[PDB]
Design a protein around this nucleic acid. Structure first.
Ligand SMILES: [Mg+2]
Ligand SMILES: [Zn+2]
Ligand SMILES: [Zn+2]
Ligand SMILES: [Zn+2]
Lengths: 113, 66, 394, 133, 140, 263, 56, 49, 196
RNA sequence: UGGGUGGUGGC
């Protein structure tokens, strides 16, 4: 009866940004990013994809409570890399792989019919 | 009561397969084999039809309310 | 019921209308989650706010002068999980370790050195448990006369707050005084002892997620050979009680101090079937593996004990009323399925079976009388306890 | 850099309580009454009875938080096969030459006895290990 | 018929396989006593069925003979608080409390006794999927 | 690099063999194909007249479980951002139904096939009840008797599984990788012996056994997957797969844009 | 029944649930119970703005 | 139901006393104040007229 | 059906469940730690017999005291193409990295007890007081207040912060003001105030 | 916005 909305899982509020960055000044070259309105489905995909790269050193996320559709992530790469750039390249590579995936799947369903 | 639509666990729509299930039962089938023919292979869509017990016949036993 | 049973807290606002707790505070209030009610009084002034915030707050009531020990410890899952985590042969890849050390609110930002460098970096979980516990601790314990060489890997020595060896279990981090929590309290004040429970529970829940842990019907089963050994032993015990019957009903039995003939007879019976139960449960404990789940839980002590596994798998033992064996409810027998004056264990309520095999109906009913004792106790003597406690208070 | 070197005989292996971790007891060849015990992982480096072990203790693998290693750098460990880091937790000057060093590899153990003339430099805090072959 | 006074003067075996003295060492079954005291018994009575010792809110329970008996008492004193179907004429009846549970399934662990409380034709719950595994501390 | 291998296909299921992606990316596909597929179902129900043996929100619930066609659905917008105050024919599929047991004897089963589309932003073939064959009467909504007037008016609007699972696109998703445990990611519980008692996968015969002399390939990773994306009939399985990937792309791209716009 | 102990106000009462994603000194509050109960904070010179917002 | 009242906390009338084979319920009795009193007639009970 | 009771602790959506090899997710997850001390092994026997009678598709006779052992159920579950003791290799829903231990998993019959949380939530600022004693009223139905009883005052004394106790038994209750004549010490003093 | 009795259920 205090039951909230279940479009709190994907729709952002008005003056809240979708992507809220705060750089963590404990160690150099690390950042904390307050993602709005998601779950694991973004996060794990970003985790393992940020994992295998060389220049990335530390990357870790947590979902503070699963009855709230938010999560927060930590991102420290090496010295040289602005890590935001690395994550943008990470998105580029993921969409590259998946668009290749859709492409060959279309071809394979064309053959299998 | 009356058959639900999906499964409770998975979500394969099953509600159509009630009348066919009774008609397969009429010939003397066995209930597992009847579910076998309907293509129900996870047990989720096997408990969503196997357990189910029927009351809405009893509600239509009330000779007219109006 | 004691001076922690009112404790101050802080406010966290959540939807979905129930009260949320930490689960380390489950022990002092004595609350389970089968539907308890807990109240919430509110201050209406500044004065009472500071009164609560400086005295009745949880971090200032950790150590109970009842028994000069901490009474707020670790409960079911965090405990049995951390015991599964810091066994010696548990290794973790670096990637999952990134998250696991992200969960600590007091982690600085420095990973430890992985305890293997090559051929592929791993860890062991004791260093991750060392990430939580702050700098400035010592704890030395000798269990069973261990060495500094540690073959059984029990015991515990901690220097710097980094674990050196040992399986961290209840008898270190439970409610036991002179344990880890008490030591942290004495050496660091309240607040770091507050953050101890946060660090440990969040860590071991994330890891007990990605490991997982379960319990299945096989876990109370031992192989057929150990079942044969338990059956042989308890059969030999029934031979022993037949010897008791033979000598005492052939009047060859010697009488103990202070007890007459039937009292020492029943006392002999009680000792002998308890010996049956103890040796049989011991054999069934000895056979079971260590990847076996139930033995992990009892050897963690988060819930249960030795007699649990003995009763589930090997033997339940004697059904009691008021400490004794069961009265002949009728003349000379304690059901109408028995003969007269048969003091055999299956008459007056010894479950020979496990829980697992099934009970004969009579044995089921005698265990019903056991539950009957427990019910009448827990809803009758609490009268006397309440009245006594009111009178000592006033 | 290396503060120890010796070659060892594998006499006993205890898998036992642990499916992934075994205990070796190595008695030295080059100078006996140097007893060495090292708990070890099977599936990173399986060992067996009566093999040969080159055992080395160092304090710096150069010839602060650990990142995973680059390719461009290099270590002392590059000619080795099982590299574990540890901590010197108990140093006991005993008898005539019963000199026992207890250094722990984080849940793993390492007892060492023998002559003072070998172990005399070992009084440190963080001591590696580097098994060859 | 017997009441509690003739219960004094009888001699029962539990199941009709125990009337004939039977025939091992299998670690699945259950162990009846031998009853080798009287070589030549005169059994006068044998139970129709042992699960007929129960109460009405007790025969519902799947296998009562494998539990710690306070939980048997708890299940019998909770079985009365099921949401389900109370009588089939909730259209015309006007009562201050009534609750229909939507989708009531006869349990796959039915008994043979639930035919005689009609509970397989009026159930008060469902079959949902059990998975006994600590997942993220929420079932502590 | 990543390679697709369809193994079976029919219209109620697809069992493919996605090869050579990470494990997180395949399971992220799984989470998408349960959750974030925009489809169409019955969102506000208005009874014009009911007199049944069944109550009202009961029947609105069961109607919410009913499978519609939403093949054309991405040129239909979301309800909560469509440019009308309460429903019009830009974003609705208004079903008005009144079956009515006329004649005072017998059993009247309001089925799925009697459900009438009255309007819809056409001629996009949306909102039809999904038909197995064309003689698929189907979903068992009601049993009506003498004069029991059931006149109902539904709206159909566009929600995802996150709001509620009446917008479930699909049904049940198998998933496995390394059927012979060559990573030792899993650890068997075992009484006697690990090999005998756990029966082989349905993908055991697509690969080889392990050899006992082989060491633990520590630098190996999981690399071959198998999943099973069945259908409710609401979409066809190829379209499911396609749009699930498409949606997951779009969410990732929006994250990219918020990066670049914060930038 | 009325002087040594009595009934009083500004209480609340419910059924509880565990939640390990928490500190040790935190207790979850359902929203409606936060709406019903209150606390008199003094309007001071260091809390005007938020309290005016809480009016709003 | 049983009229001892509740005056007398005695555990002899609250025992599952062993005449109960098939006459009352060894499981069912409420939690608490009623316990030991309240006897549900068994699934083979009949009342002699 | 064996007392292992409790409340719905948390709600997870569909994908976030663990899920076995076919796609089956679960709906109710009782605790491992709920079992080993409560010693209710019948609950496991029900879950196993449930899964078998689902797959062979009929309702298995679980009336007690038969020769229905566990062995017949074990053999039938194996010989219909499964693991013998219940387990299937279940996964994280957040990675799919396999859950290291195999998870036990099946259907079982559940029920719904009559309590809810929407009938026992209650909080109270003020309101209805009795005429007779002006202490706030008793019962949920009239939105009464809670009994801050004796032994609550006992633990307040044990903590000792009695200023909180002077909040509780003066200020959130029947705060009441009388007068005394200082000579005969009584409250007979008649109080007119606007004439003072 | 009644009292006052009494019953059953929750921890
Ligand atoms: Mg309780
Ligand atoms: Zn299903
Ligand atoms: Zn519009
Ligand atoms: Zn005076």
């Amino acid at each position: 009866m205090n039951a909230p909305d279940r479009f709190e899982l994907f729709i952002l509020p008005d003056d809240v940004p979708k992507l809220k960055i705060t750089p963590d000044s404990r160690v150099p070259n690390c950042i904390i990013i307050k993602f709005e309105r998601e779950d694991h489905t973004l996060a794990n995909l970003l985790r393992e994809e940020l994992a295998l790269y060389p220049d990335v050193t530390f990357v870790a996320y947590k979902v503070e409570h699963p009855l709230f559709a938010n999560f927060v992530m930590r991102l420290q790469t090496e010295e040289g890399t602005r890590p935001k750039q690395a994550l943008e390249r990470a998105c580029a590579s993921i969409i590259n792989k998946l668009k290749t995936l859709d492409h060959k799947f279309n071809e394979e369903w064309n053959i299998k019919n | 009561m009356i058959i639900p639509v999906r499964c409770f666990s998975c979500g394969k729509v099953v509600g159509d397969k009630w009348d066919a299930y009774l008609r397969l039962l009429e010939e003397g089938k066995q209930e597992g084999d009847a579910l076998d023919e309907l293509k129900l292979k996870r047990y989720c869509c096997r408990r969503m039809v196997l357990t189910h017990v029927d009351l809405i016949e009893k509600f239509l036993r009330y000779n007219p309310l109006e | 019921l004691h001076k922690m049973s009112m404790m101050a807290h802080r406010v966290k606002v959540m939807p979905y209308s129930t009260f949320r707790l930490n689960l380390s505070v489950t022990s002092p209030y004595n609350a389970d989650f089968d539907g308890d009610e807990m109240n919430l009084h509110v201050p209406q002034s500044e004065e009472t706010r500071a009164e609560l915030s400086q005295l009745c707050a949880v971090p200032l009531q950790i150590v109970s002068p009842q028994s000069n020990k901490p009474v707020m410890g670790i409960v079911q899952d965090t405990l049995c999980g951390v015991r599964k985590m810091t066994l010696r042969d548990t290794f973790i890849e670096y990637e999952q370790v990134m998250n696991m050390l992200f969960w600590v609110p007091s982690w600085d930002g420095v990973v430890p050195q992985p305890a293997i460098l090559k051929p592929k970096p791993l860890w062991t979980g004791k260093q991750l448990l060392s990430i939580a516990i702050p700098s400035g601790i010592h704890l030395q314990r000798t269990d069973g006369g261990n060495s500094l060489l540690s073959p059984k890997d029990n015991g515990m020595l901690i220097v710097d707050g980094k674990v050196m060896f040992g399986v961290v279990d209840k008898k270190t981090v439970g409610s036991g005084g002179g344990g880890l929590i008490h030591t942290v309290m004495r050496e660091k004040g309240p607040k770091i002892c507050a953050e101890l429970f946060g660090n440990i529970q969040k860590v071991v829940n994330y890891w007990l997620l990605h490991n997982g842990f379960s319990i299945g019907i096989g876990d109370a089963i031992a192989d057929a050979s150990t079942m044969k050994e338990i059956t042989h032993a308890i059969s030999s015990a029934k031979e022993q009680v037949q010897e008791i019957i033979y000598k005492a009903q052939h009047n060859e039995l010697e009488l103990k101090p202070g007890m007459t003939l039937r009292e020492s007879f029943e006392g002999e019976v009680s000792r002998t079937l308890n010996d049956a139960r103890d040796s049989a449960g011991r054999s069934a404990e000895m056979n079971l593996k260590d990847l076996n789940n139930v033995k992990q839980m009892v050897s963690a002590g988060s819930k249960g004990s030795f007699i649990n596994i003995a009763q589930m798998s090997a033997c339940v033992g004697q059904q009691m009323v008021e400490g004794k064996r069961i009265a002949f409810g009728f003349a000379d027998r304690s059901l109408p399925h028995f003969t007269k004056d048969d003091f055999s264990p299956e008459s007056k309520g010894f479950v020979e079976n496990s829980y697992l095999r099934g009970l004969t109906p009579q044995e089921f009913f005698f265990h019903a009388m056991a539950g009957r004792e427990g019910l009448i106790d827990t809803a009758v003597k609490t009268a006397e306890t309440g009245y006594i406690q009111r009178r000592l208070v006033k | 850099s290396a503060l120890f070197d010796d070659i060892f005989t594998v006499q006993t292996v205890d898998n036992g309580r642990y499916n992934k971790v075994s205990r070796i007891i190595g008695i030295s060849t080059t100078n006996s009454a140097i007893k060495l015990t090292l708990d070890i992982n099977n599936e990173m480096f399986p060992v067996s009875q009566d093999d040969s072990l080159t055992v080395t203790l160092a304090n710096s693998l150069s010839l602060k938080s650990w990142r995973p290693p680059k390719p461009t750098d290099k270590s002392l460990a590059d000619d080795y096969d099982y590299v574990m880091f540890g901590t010197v937790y108990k140093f006991e000057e005993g008898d005539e030459d019963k000199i026992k060093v207890y250094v722990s590899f984080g849940g793993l153990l390492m007892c060492l006895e023998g002559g003072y003339k070998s172990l005399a430099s070992l009084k440190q805090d963080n001591l590696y290990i580097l098994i060859r072959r | 018929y017997v009441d509690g006074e003739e219960e004094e003067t009888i001699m029962i075996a539990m199941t009709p396989e125990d009337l004939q003295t039977r025939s091992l060492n299998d670690t699945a079954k259950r162990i009846k006593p031998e009853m080798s005291t009287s070589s030549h018994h005169t059994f006068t009575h044998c139970e129709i069925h042992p699960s007929m010792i129960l109460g009405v809110a007790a025969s519902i329970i799947p296998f009562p003979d494998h539990n710690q008996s306070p939980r048997n008492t708890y299940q019998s004193a909770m079985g009365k608080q099921a949401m389900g179907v109370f009588l089939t004429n909730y259209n015309v009846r006007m009562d201050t409390m009534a609750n229909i549970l939507y989708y009531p399934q006869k349990p796959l662990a039915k008994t043979q006794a639930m035919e005689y409380l009609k509970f397989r034709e009026l159930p008060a719950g469902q079959n949902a999927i059990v998975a006994i595994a600590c997942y993220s501390g929420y079932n502590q | 690099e990543p390679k697709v291998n369809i193994i079976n296909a029919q219209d109620d299921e697809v069992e493919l063999m996605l090869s050579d992606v990470n494990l997180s990316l395949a399971n992220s596909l799984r989470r998408t194909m349960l959750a974030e597929v925009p489809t169409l179902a019955i969102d506000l129900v208005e009874i014009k007249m009911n007199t049944s043996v069944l109550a009202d929100e009961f029947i609105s619930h069961r109607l919410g479980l009913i499978p519609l066609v939403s093949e054309d659905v991405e040129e239909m917008k979301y309800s909560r951002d469509c440019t009308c105050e309460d429903y019009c024919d830009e974003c609705s599929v208004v079903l008005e139904l009144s079956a009515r047991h006329e004649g005072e004897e017998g059993t009247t089963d309001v089925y799925s096939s009697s459900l009438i589309k009255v309007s819809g932003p056409g001629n996009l073939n949306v909102g039809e009840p999904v038909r197995r064959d064309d003689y698929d009467q189907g979903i068992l909504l009601c049993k009506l008797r003498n004069h029991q007037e059931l006149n109902i008016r539904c709206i159909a609007k566009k929600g995802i599984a996150k709001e509620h699972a009446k917008w479930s696109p699909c049904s049940a998703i198998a998933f496995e990788y390394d059927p012979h445990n060559k990573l030792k990611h899993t650890d068997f519980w075992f009484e006697v012996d690990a090999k005998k008692e756990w029966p082989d996968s349905k993908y055991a015969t697509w690969e080889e056994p392990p050899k006992p002399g082989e060491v633990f390939d520590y630098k190996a990773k999981p690399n071959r997957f198998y999943m099973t994306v069945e259908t409710t009939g609401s979409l066809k399985a190829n379209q499911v797969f396609s749009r699930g990937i498409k949606t997951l792309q779009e969410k990732l791209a929006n994250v990219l844009f918020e990066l670049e716009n914060s930038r | 029944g009325n002087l040594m102990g009595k009934r009083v106000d500004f209480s609340a009462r419910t059924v509880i649930s565990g939640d390990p994603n928490l500190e040790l000194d935190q207790v979850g509050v359902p929203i409606s119970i936060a709406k019903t109960l209150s606390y008199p904070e003094t309007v001071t010179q260091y809390n005007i703005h938020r309290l005016t917002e809480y009016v709003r | 139901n049983t009229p001892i009242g509740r005056d007398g906390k005695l555990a002899k009338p609250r025992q599952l006393h062993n005449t109960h084979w098939g006459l009352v319920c060894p499981a069912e009795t409420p939690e608490g104040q009623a316990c030991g009193l309240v006897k549900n007639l068994s699934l083979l009970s009949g009342i002699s007229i | 059906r064996h007392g292992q009771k409790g409340t719905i602790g948390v709600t997870y959506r569909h994908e976030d469940m663990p899920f076995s090899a076919e796609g089956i997710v679960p709906d109710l997850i009782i605790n491992p730690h709920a079992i080993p001390s409560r010693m209710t092994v019948a609950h496991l026997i029900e879950c196993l017999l449930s899964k078998v009678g689902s797959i062979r598709g009929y309702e298995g006779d679980a009336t007690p005291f038969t020769d229905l052992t566990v062995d017949a159920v074990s053999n039938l579950l194996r010989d219909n193409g499964y693991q013998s003791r219940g387990f299937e290799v279940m996964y994280n829903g957040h990675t799919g990295k396999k859950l290291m231990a195999q998870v036990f998993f099946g259907p079982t019959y559940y029920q719904r007890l009559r309590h809810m949380v929407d009938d026992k939530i209650h909080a109270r600022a003020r309101g209805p007081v009795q005429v007779l004693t002006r202490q706030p009223v008793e019962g949920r139905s009239r939105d009464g207040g809670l009994r801050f009883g004796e032994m609550e005052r006992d633990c307040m004394i044990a903590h000792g912060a009695a200023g909180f106790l002077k909040e509780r038994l003066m200020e959130a209750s029947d705060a009441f003001r009388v007068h005394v004549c200082g000579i005969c010490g009584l409250m007979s003093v008649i109080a007119n105030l606007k004439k003072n």
